[PDB]
């Protein structure tokens, strides 16, 4: 669970030392960010039903061949398993916004993604076609503040480089 606190108490336990001001100055920046980083996770939690529906409907509309028979988007229950597969990814980015770092993403969704979509024939090109809609589909004066959208857009690009 890589966060700012778990970085320094594991760097210090590596050496075997006490928390000095190379460990106390790090958590000061955790105060200088949580006033705006927690603002995005407050908005995302109360809005995610309108976001996960708009994210998948910008995926199947472009990747229309996935609803052909023989594919991975066969029935209604597979498409109902496709919004379940995305509303996890909008929940895991909500969990990364409150631990401060990229803790929940790189060990719950990312870790082992290369073998669970290659085996079950899930195209990893369609996932980036929906998350990049949500990144492109962002608008900082109305929907957020200017400093939440700096960092809320920075975790989706952590997914996109780790899915590509």
């Amino acid at each position: 669970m890589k966060s700012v606190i778990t970085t320094v108490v594991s760097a210090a336990d590596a050496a075997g030392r006490f928390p000095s001001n190379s460990d106390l100055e790090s958590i000061q920046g955790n105060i200088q960010r949580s006033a705006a980083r927690l603002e995005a996770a407050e908005k995302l939690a109360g809005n995610h039903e309108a976001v996960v529906k708009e994210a998948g409907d910008a995926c199947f509309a472009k990747y229309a061949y996935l609803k052909n028979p023989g594919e991975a988007g066969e029935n209604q229950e597979k498409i109902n398993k496709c919004y379940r597969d995305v509303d996890h990814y909008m929940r895991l980015v909500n969990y990364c916004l409150v631990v401060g770092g990229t803790g929940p993403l790189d060990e719950w969704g990312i870790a082992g993604a290369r073998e669970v979509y290659r085996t079950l024939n899930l195209p990893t090109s369609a996932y980036v076609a929906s998350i990049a809609y949500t990144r492109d589909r962002l608008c900082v004066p109305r929907d957020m503040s200017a400093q939440a959208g700096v960092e809320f857009s920075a975790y989706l690009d952590y997914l996109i480089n780790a899915l590509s």
């Binding site: 060990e107 719950w108 990312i110 870790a111 082992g112 993604a113 073998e115 669970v116 085996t119 079950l120």
Partner: protein, 177 residues
């Protein structure tokens, strides 16, 4: 570790005996059907990738609680480990089918698997549905009875090998239950 030939030579080692008439007749029958034994093993490893995906997904669609939050196959790291925990199982069963003796998956796979899964938290009552599905796939391939793939073979019968591979797949469910 032991094949069908070396199984005989450790039984006649206890008697300080040679190999003669009655103990070589059942061993020449292994050589006689030896072309069918290769011809059955290749039918499994040619399409083992879709055999481990269908068997894992067959356990999940029967038990929907395995992908619940707090289910054993909930995250991707636990799911991808499941997709290779079943491929290690299939690799060692195809070794015991090839060598004609169950003393290779007994040693390097089965011994200590029950104590390993209960430590990690793997449900063993749901790990046996994944193997029993794979038992039904493996006997529907060395006999051409697969519904969505037909493979060309020489004419003849292989129901003796269907009971040999079903004895291996049942003892995986007998070593972890």
């Amino acid at each position: 570790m032991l094949d069908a030939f070396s199984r005989v030579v450790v039984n006649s080692d206890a008697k300080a005996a040679y190999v003669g008439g009655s103990d070589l007749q059942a061993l020449k029958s292994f050589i006689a059907d030896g072309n069918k034994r290769l011809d059955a093993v290749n039918s499994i490893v040619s399409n083992a990738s879709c055999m481990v995906s269908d068997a894992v997904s067959g356990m999940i669609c029967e038990n929907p609680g395995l992908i619940s939050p707090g289910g054993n196959c909930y995250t991707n790291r636990r799911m991808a480990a499941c997709l290779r925990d079943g491929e290690i199982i299939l690799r060692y069963v195809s070794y015991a089918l090839l060598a004609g003796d169950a003393s290779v998956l007994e040693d390097r796979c089965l011994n200590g698997l029950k104590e390993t899964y209960i430590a990690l938290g793997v449900p063993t009552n749901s790990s046996i549905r994944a193997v029993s599905i794979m038992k039904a796939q493996a006997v529907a391939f060395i006999t051409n009875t697969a519904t969505e793939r037909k493979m060309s073979f020489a004419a003849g019968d292989c129901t003796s090998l269907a009971s040999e591979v079903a004895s291996y797949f049942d003892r995986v469910g007998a070593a972890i239950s």
